[PDB]
Amino acid sequence: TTICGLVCQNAVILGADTRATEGPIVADKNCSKLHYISKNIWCAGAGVAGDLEHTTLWLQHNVELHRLNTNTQPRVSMCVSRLTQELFKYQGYKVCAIVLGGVDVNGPQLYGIHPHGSSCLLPFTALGSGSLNAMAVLEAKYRDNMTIEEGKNLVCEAICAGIFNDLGSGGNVDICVITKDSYQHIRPYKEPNMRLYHLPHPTIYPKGTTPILSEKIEY
């Protein structure tokens, strides 16, 4: 749970780790914590994965329904007002810190939501357990109007700082670029290799015990 995002010269860049944990142990090394709200806005979240995953689905489809009744591309501020009112109703129970960034008729804007319903427009941020580790490297290196390429690898360092220094975050890093025309969501981007690889040793066919075998064929 290390998510981050920053505003660039004409686009927003969102980066996130890939790891879901039961708290002592890790469930999977590859969880897409980035989410598609619309073609021009994307969101990333932290907190409980239950409330986090539904809310984005609820947000994405409300936005899409809004983008159909209305005939213009969705506003970034529209989702912030939609989420925060939803989060405000459930006083603090729907705990999900969310960063959503995108572009609209205004500039590339990025918002950091909070589980209690508060929001704030930022040039760069980071949430999750590795937020503090990721926010440090962000501040030390952030500038205004960074180029897309230069700002893209800054998030790589921003996430990798949380990947390595935080226990609760790890795995591959994934990035999304939310430029006006379209997005670019790169699913693998990092996490180097060359450890002691486990030798595959499959147990032979005559194993197990199987008191019963109720074979049947369906069609």
Binding site: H66, N69, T70, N71, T72, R75, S77, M78, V80, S81, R82, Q85, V105
Partner: protein, 251 residues
Amino acid sequence: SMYDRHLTIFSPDGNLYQIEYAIKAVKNTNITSVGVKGENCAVIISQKKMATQYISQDKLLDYNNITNIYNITDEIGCSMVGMPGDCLSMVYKARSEASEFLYSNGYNVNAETLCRNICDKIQVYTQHAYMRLHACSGMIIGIDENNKPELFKFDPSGFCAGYRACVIGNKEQESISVLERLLEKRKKKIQQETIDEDIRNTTILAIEALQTILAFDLKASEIEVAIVSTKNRNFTQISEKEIDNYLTYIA
């Protein structure tokens, strides 16, 4: 039964006569309101006259009060023409939608979404027999997020077409011809260098259309214009001191 008195029941020819009768109710007021759309500028006109109703006409009413032009938000304005009670009720419904849209979505309603939402209610009347249509047809102007003008007209029958030179009143059968003709002159003029000439290309165009649609003289105290052009985007009622300034461009 023979009761075509119902608001909804299809007549054997497939028509809803109540829709036709409600439209006839708007024509009965013989109040003509004209709005035209230019380049990054929209203007709208009404007649500042008593709706033709049972009550005695103008003797002591302060004519300043009598207007057919309202505004829905700081940037969206409308010209409801119809029964005075229905027009007053229509704007309050319209104002609530633009207010609710703002609170629920965090940004100001489009001029095209507001009238579409309005039409989605006028349809409910059309389909529920327990109530009655608002005999009110309105024209809505505004500026979208692309700094482009927008003009839309809705009808007692839920219908939200949206024109670029629109007329409502009792002369729309022939006002469609003059407005089409009079709007082609600004197309024949291909100077294309009019830099914020809403004052002298659009407002004067609309006043000329009203002077031609109905053949009176248009005293400055019996008309009113409102413009939501870019560089204002506020739907400000243009004062009488410069309305007769355009009325002095009969030359």
